[PDB]
Amino acid sequence: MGSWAEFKQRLAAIKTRCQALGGSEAECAAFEKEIAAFESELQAYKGKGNPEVEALRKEAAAIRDECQAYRHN
Secondary structure, three states, X not given: OXXXXXXXXXXXXXXXXXXXXXXXXXXXXXXXXXXXXXXXXHOOOOOOOOHHHHHHHHHHHHHHXXXXXXXXX
């Protein structure tokens, strides 16, 4: 199972708060950064295109786009 559970939880909270946009110029930033390191950390594991990093990569990218579309569009 590895540490997918942790990444799943944190990722879920980031996506939820990002999709809902509680209303904080900082929150959005924290998500973009956190997500960036998440995908970069998962892709550094080993499998550049592993099946596990696939999901995290997709969700992460989505979150980043949303944040940019909220305070950069």
